[PDB]
A paper describes a structure:
A truncated stable, soluble core domain spanning residues 83–248 of RVFV NSs (NSs-ΔNΔC) was identified using NMR spectroscopy. The crystals were found to be extremely fragile, and diffracted synchrotron X-rays to 2.2 Å resolution. The structure was successfully phased from the anomalous sulfur signal in a single native crystal and refined to high quality. The NSs-ΔNΔC monomer, molecular mass 19,029 Da, measures approximately 30 × 30 × 50 Å. It is composed of eight α-helices with helices α1-α6 and α8 arranged around a long central helix α7. Two NSs-ΔNΔC monomers constitute the asymmetric unit, with an interface formed by their α8 helices. We therefore conclude the NSs-ΔNΔC structure represents a novel fold. In the crystal lattice NSs-ΔNΔC molecules were found to pack into a highly organized network of two fibril-like assemblies, referred to here as F1 and F2, creating large solvent channels. The T1 interface perpendicular to the F1 fibril axis is defined by an extensive network of hydrogen bonds and salt bridges between the basic face of α1 (Lys84, Gln87, Arg88) and the acidic face of α8 (Glu220, Glu221, Ser228), leading to a large buried interface area of 4 × 852 Å2. Therefore, we conclude that the F1 crystal fibril is not only more stable than F2, but that it also represents the architecture of NSs in intranuclear filaments.
Innate immune antagonism of RVFV is primarily mediated by its main virulence factor, the 30 kDa non-structural protein (NSs), which is transcribed and translated from a subgenomic mRNA derived from the antigenomic S segment early during infection. NSs impedes interferon production through three known mechanisms. A characteristic feature of RVFV pathogenesis is formation of 0.5 μm thick proteinaceous filaments formed by bundles of thin fibrils in the nuclei of infected cells. Here we describe the first high-resolution structure of a bunyaviral NSs protein.
Residue numbers in the entry: 79 to 244
Write the structure that this text describes.
């Protein structure tokens, strides 16, 4: 059916035009977008943005592939969507994200939402290590500012574990 809201749509649409190296240059941010695939990816942003020109015919295949790679079920497409929905809920519970926002109708949006929450918590740690801001970092700073005033609960728990340098 339809979701009750899509709180991070605007941020998603900004991130969908950025590039992977705008995030991978910062250690905590890199880790933020390395869930759920086990490598840094903007693919869920790309499929969720309202600004990205995509082709509908191949959307369905891309979504299937992303689900299968996330949860590692490849033998049944519907099991893999269940599997990805489970990953979403698992991470959202840890992040303190309200599960009413994530009913599993638009799994691409839901992963990007959870990644946004990860990014906003991760940015604080990179900033307190005095990284050099780029426009990706500034966008995250601005969204946090807006939320601290509007609806601080949308950012979840302040429980990001800092990445340790190699």
């Amino acid at each position: 059916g339809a979701m009750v809201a899509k709180p991070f749509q605007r941020l998603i649409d900004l991130i969908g035009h950025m590039t992977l190296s705008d995030f991978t240059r910062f250690p905590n941010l890199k880790e933020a977008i390395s869930w759920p695939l086990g490598e840094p990816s903007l693919a869920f942003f790309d499929l969720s943005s309202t600004r990205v020109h995509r082709n509908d015919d191949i959307r369905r295949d891309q979504i299937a592939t992303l689900a299968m790679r996330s949860c590692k079920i490849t033998n049944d497409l519907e099991d893999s969507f269940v599997g990805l929905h489970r990953m979403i809920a698992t991470e959202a519970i840890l992040r303190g994200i309200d599960l009413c926002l994530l009913p599993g109708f638009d799994l691409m949006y839901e992963v990007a939402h959870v990644q946004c929450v990860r990014l906003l918590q991760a940015a604080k740690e990179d900033i307190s290590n005095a990284v050099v801001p780029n426009s990706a970092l500034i966008v995250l700073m601005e969204e946090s500012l807006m939320l601290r005033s509007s609806l601080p609960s949308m950012m979840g728990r302040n429980n990001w574990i800092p990445v340790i340098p190699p």
